[PDB]
Amino acid sequence: AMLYPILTQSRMLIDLSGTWRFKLDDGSGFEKKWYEKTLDDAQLMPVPSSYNDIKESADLRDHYGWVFYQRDLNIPAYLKTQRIVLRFAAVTHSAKVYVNGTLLCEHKGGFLPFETEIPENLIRDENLLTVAVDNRIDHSTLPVGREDESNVLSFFPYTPTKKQNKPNFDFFNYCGITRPVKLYTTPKDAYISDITLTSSLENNTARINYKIDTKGSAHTAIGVYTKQGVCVAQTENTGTEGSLTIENAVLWEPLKPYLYEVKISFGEDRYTLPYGIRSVAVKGNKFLINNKPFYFKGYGKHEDTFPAGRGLNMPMNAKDISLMKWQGANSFRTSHYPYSEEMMRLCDEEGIVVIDETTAVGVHLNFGKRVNTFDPIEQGGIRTQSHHKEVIKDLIARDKNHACVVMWSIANEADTGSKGAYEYFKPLFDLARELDPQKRPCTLVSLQMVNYKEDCTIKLSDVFCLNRYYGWYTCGADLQAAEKMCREELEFWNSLGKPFMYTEYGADTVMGLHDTTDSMFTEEYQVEYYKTNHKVTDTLDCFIGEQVWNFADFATSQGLIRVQGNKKGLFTRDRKPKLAAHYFKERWSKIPDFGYKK
Amino acid sequence: NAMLYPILTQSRMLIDLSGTWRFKLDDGSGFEKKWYEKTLDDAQLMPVPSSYNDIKESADLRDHYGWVFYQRDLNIPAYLKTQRIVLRFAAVTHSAKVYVNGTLLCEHKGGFLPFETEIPENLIRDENLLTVAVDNRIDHSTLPVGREDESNVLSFFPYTPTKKQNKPNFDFFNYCGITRPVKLYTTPKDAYISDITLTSSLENNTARINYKIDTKGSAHTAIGVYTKQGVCVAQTENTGTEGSLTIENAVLWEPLKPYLYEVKISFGEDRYTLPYGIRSVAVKGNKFLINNKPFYFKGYGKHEDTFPAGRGLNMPMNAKDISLMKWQGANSFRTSHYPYSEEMMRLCDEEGIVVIDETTAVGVHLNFRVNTFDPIEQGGIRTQSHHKEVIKDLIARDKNHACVVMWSIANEADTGSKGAYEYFKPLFDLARELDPQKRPCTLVSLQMVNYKEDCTIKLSDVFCLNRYYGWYTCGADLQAAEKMCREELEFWNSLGKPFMYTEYGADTVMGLHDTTDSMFTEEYQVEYYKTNHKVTDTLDCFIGEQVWNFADFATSQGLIRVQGNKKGLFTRDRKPKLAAHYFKERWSKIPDFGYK
Ligand SMILES: O=C(O)c1cn(C2CC2)c2cc(N3C=CN([C@@H]4O[C@H](C(=O)O)[C@@H](O)[C@H](O)[C@H]4O)CC3)c(F)cc2c1=O
Ligand SMILES: O=C(O)c1cn(C2CC2)c2cc(N3C=CN([C@@H]4O[C@H](C(=O)O)[C@@H](O)[C@H](O)[C@H]4O)CC3)c(F)cc2c1=O
């Protein structure tokens, strides 16, 4: 369980972000136990941030292995009366946390939070907090790294100077303490550890079913307040499970959010949770939000800004939401990893719909004998399923109460058209459906493949989410051919009668390149590419959404097809609109959020 | 007045209140209707810390005139009330009124320096609302100065504006809001440290730290000095308020080779740790001496300016900017044209970057017929009183920084006109009185036809010149620029005191090129700098070069501003122009010490 740390009448919240000490591992940092003493001959590194782009050093940017972060932690002794917790919102990719040279916890997985109590007996007058951070990726990590020194994106072979991470995905491997580190407290004896809300609409009355997980013995009380502060439901001494009702409930709607304040108390412990009331259901070829047929308009994003890389950037989060409202979007996907809680909470407050995605990109070993992706671990297949289950558990545990989250994406462009794929994914879908109290739709995001009718998403998903590049990776500069090949395939998907959508489609576009005559990489070609795709999708009644690749240009590994990163953004990396951004502002201004295809 | 940087200690809580706050533009009725007494209704959400102007896509927000209201909930543990509870605002631009529940706690004027207020415990209810009203208006009484007609500082045909707008008397965009973090911190109620003053004495081959510890209440004082590894190298218990400690084996703080001791102070239960670099600064003859060695400034005037936060604290960019300056071979910058965040100052102490620390005094000029320094009752500028408070507050905040080597009293005031000396004499006197280290003081000189009457000559320890030979004069005639540059700078050189460029540059749009001198091109920017250097490299009293600017930055709109000021060596997103590589090469051949 992972409630978002907040300041309450019972909970201290102390942010440890700022300038920390930082040192690259030279192969001896664990042997010489650097975590037992002040880091020596070190740099300084801002926290939170990815550390790859902060300096000017290729050796820093392309480091392979561990680094050590460290700061002093001199906390008031008064807090020893409370329970003291160190919360790491995200550390990419794996972490070992030491206080005063004692290992307190380890974590695997770069994009979900973890915490540990500091034992009171470990706290001195002055303390050292050391975080060791591993950036290595392989066939057992999510995201998947290649183990063969080849590039996912050479014409003549060469021996690399140093060993480097080789991503099996198309985005730069930004690592470090990506999101805030905070110290918080709760009472020692009795405290709230999790909160689970679900809702049901009976005419204009909402029934909110709650389960409040707690530690210790005390009495649980829950209260529901309007934005303006009026109590509208209250029940006392309810224990763990229970329900309550709101008369004339204001529903949470895309672009028209409404959040109630849910105040929980358990003994001395107090926690407030914002909560929007809304329903999600797939019915026929319809994606129903509040029982109305939704049409997705938006993007796959990345958490990517300069110079922090993947690091939390709160002004840019507000800027990006403001740009999506300017453009007329209503939704995005968290490609390809869970985003910060601060973004998710802002989406709840601003009314932006989210497809929440796990970290499972690169689950594909065929993107001295040939190997199948989903062969036995013994026979060389991918080793990600056990961690994949943990990521699903933790993602839903973190984000289950968000009104903005309407669909879970189990993986991006895994090898779903090969043998064994169904056997790998069926337990993960079953896991997602078992653990989400709201029972939201589940999808996997489908790689473009020649044997698309063989994609196991057909057996598993509530919505078929397709990544397709008709006019870019195929039919490049032949948009007539693109239109015919797009129609041939999408008519197949449309004939299945279930809702389907684009979760990626686009064309690399360098701002400032132009031509009136179709030419790839120009601003005009981006627009023509999209016009050609919309000629097809606009005629298909099961096509219920368009999310472009990408919201904005972002950093990737180096390669002959990556023009200083991925250039498929509608916006540049500094959020400036290309021609196609204005095209979509016009297009989305004429398409309603509901009832476009009714 | 005393403004210790808030830190987490054994006796002090530190609660950061940054995040998403509610935000509402005032419509003229915000105070009349007492908006601060309830939740803001029909409000937006705004990140804190940040400037608010560029977060949305609204021109009316960006160009808003007057007040806005920020607000958040503040539900804190009651056991905090056993401590002294303090609300610290690191910066609110330009003026603030702070309310807790219905109650006005404080009001502040000056948009770039911290202020704080105790929260009386009788006011803290179970649930609390914190409201901050922020005024963005500028006039002849604010620093920085706003114009009080419809004039733009940057028009061919006259027109009536749709709405009233601030008219800056300065070349940067009027970014406003809760610029820097808002934090809640605590100290012991009954005995606590209010200020710490440290100075260094290097005479007789013996390095000593002199301390003076300001307290409230009655208790015993102790001070210890610790190396970076944590070895105690001097300590004394039950000490007086003032005293000295000898540091054997002292390592000096040097430009690009920082060393910071940790100075831990105890007073009763209170504990405060202050990083401290030991170094000397002095002007002797025509030399700027750091640790008794002749320094040559290499660097920039900067701005706090990033997209989309505007003036807002951006700590990843701070670290990126220092990395770029070390990559380029710079050793210094000036806080143009306002105090920067404490986070930047502290990072500069850590990284060995030398800082010229400047007040908010830009626009002190009414004639870019009433003269600037006429009597206030005849229309003269009305800033002198606030100018003293800013100097007091700036020195109180930054006095212990080793990186700060020089105070800049104003940028481009009307210092060649009648009355300037009398306006500035008390301010120089004040800065010298208040700085325990007695660092050099200057004002940054506007380019001016009667430069021999610049009152900087009568006041300043270092003459700091803003000159644009080859841009605002002699544009595209660099041979004439060289001659005009040499004529004036030989005058300055003949005075025998240290002098330097604090600004020089040429607007340069990345991607515009020409092998033949053409303004706005990347090549012209290089040639502009080559021409100036042809002259400055021959003048033995010229002890420093700070370009205008480190990076492109936002300004008001006008016919000569190409989406802001384009004189950066880097772009707004920190990419090097041709001239940035030119300077990396040049500054790699110029030593920090002993160039001239
Ligand atoms: O996708 C990859 O990996 C490779 C791709 N291409 C493509 C043709 C670009 C390679 C080409 C190779 N030839 C290399 C040099 N030729 C000269 O070079 C100029 C240029 O290419 O700039 C042309 O303009 C000149 O006309 C021509 O004389 C071109 C072709 C090659 F050896 C390897 C690759 C790859 O490995
Ligand atoms: O349209 C024109 O003809 C002129 C226009 N302007 C104004 C800026 C519109 C002039 C301004 C002059 N001063 C104004 C600012 N001083 C420093 O210059 C930087 C910069 O301007 O780049 C600013 O950013 C720094 O903050 C500031 O310290 C330089 C001297 C001048 F001498 C001549 C002109 C013109 O001639």
Residue numbers in the entry:
A (entry chain B): 17 to 169, 172 to 385, 394 to 624
B (entry chain A): 16 to 169, 172 to 385, 396 to 623
Give me lines lifted from the publication on this model:
We further determined the 1.95-Å-resolution crystal structure of TlGUS L1 in the presence of PNPG and ciprofloxacin, an antibiotic that is effective in the treatment of periodontitis and is known to be highly concentrated in the GCF. PNPG is a GUS substrate and initiates the catalytic cycle of the enzyme, which UNC4917 then intercepts. Thus, oral microbiome–encoded L1 GUS enzymes are subject to unique and selective inhibition by piperazine-containing drugs, such as ciprofloxacin and the synthetic inhibitor UNC4917.
To examine the structure and function of unique GUS enzymes from the oral microbiome, we recombinantly expressed and purified the following proteins from bacteria strongly associated with periodontitis: L2 and mL1 proteins from Tannerella forsythia (TfGUS L2 and TfGUS mL1) and an L1 from Treponema lecithinolyticum (TlGUS L1). Although the core glycoside hydrolase family 2 (GH2) fold is conserved among all GUS enzymes of known structure, two loops positioned adjacent to the active site influence substrate binding and catalytic activity. The presence or absence of these loops and their lengths have led to the classification of microbial GUS enzymes into several categories : loop 1 (L1), mini-L1 (mL1), loop 2 (L2), mini-loop 2 (mL2), and no loop (NL).
